[PDB]
Amino acid sequence: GAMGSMPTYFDPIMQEDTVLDENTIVYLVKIGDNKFSIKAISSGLEHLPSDPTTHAEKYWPIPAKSLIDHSSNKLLFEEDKLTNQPISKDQVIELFAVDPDKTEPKQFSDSVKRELTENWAREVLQD
Ligand code: NA
Ligand code: NA
């Protein structure tokens, strides 16, 4: 119509629909056997301990450009909004060229909680 649209995702960080661009953090998590979910967040890949909506600790990185280039695919987007429905391993291979069951995932870091714990312990023992 008169109004355009851009692909958006519901950002768990700010709890708001957010325009997807090349600065969006995008990754895959596994939520079941042959069931994977595409996630997008505005920040936090290096600081969060797990994925916000599933608390998955393991993920497969996906370039934002790959998701943007599929923005008209009805599997991933419904009315220009990122789907919350899972996709099969075959669909993952077809859309993103990654076999997750044959690729080592990355893991969210535990560094922030470790630093918090060390900060408390040092404060206890200082005067
Ligand atoms: Na954290
Ligand atoms: Na989290």
Numbering used by the authors: -4 to 122
Q: Which sentences did the original study use to describe this structure?
A:
L. pneumophila encodes molecular mimics of host E3 ligases, including the effector protein RavN, thereby subverting the ubiquitylation pathway for its own benefit during infection. Using protein crystallography, we show that the fold of RavN has only residual resemblance to conventional eukaryotic E3s, yet its mode of interaction with E2 enzymes, host proteins that are important for the ubiquitin transfer reaction, has been preserved throughout evolution. When using RavN (Lpg1111; 212 amino acids, 24 kDa), a translocated substrate of the Dot/Icm Type IV secretion system (T4SS), as bait, a protein of approximately 35 kDa in size was highly enriched in the pulldown fraction but not in the control lanes. While control reactions lacking either GST-RavN or an E2 underwent no noticeable poly-ubiquitylation, efficient poly-ubiquitylation was detected upon incubation of GST-RavN with the E2 enzymes UbcH5a, UbcH5b, UbcH5c, and UbcH6, but none of the other E2s, indicating that RavN was indeed an E3 ubiquitin ligase that preferred a select set of host E2s.
Thus, we carried out limited trypsin-mediated proteolysis in combination with Matrix Assisted Laser Desorption/Ionization–Time of Flight (MALDI–TOF) mass spectrometry to identify stable fragments that may be more amenable to crystallization. However, in the case of the RavN U-box domain, the position corresponding to αA is occupied by a segment of the loop L4 (residues 37–42; L4RavN) that connects the central β-hairpin with the equivalent loop L2E3 without altering its relative orientation. In fact, for all active RING-finger/U-box domains, the L1E3, L2E3 and αA elements create a conserved hydrophobic surface that serves as the docking site for E2 binding, as investigated for RavN below. Superimposition of their structures with that of RavN revealed the presence of three residues in RavN (Ile8, Leu43 and Pro47) that create a surface area analogous to the E2 binding regions present in Ark2C and CHIP, suggesting that these residues could be important for E2 binding and, thus, E3 ligase activity of RavN.
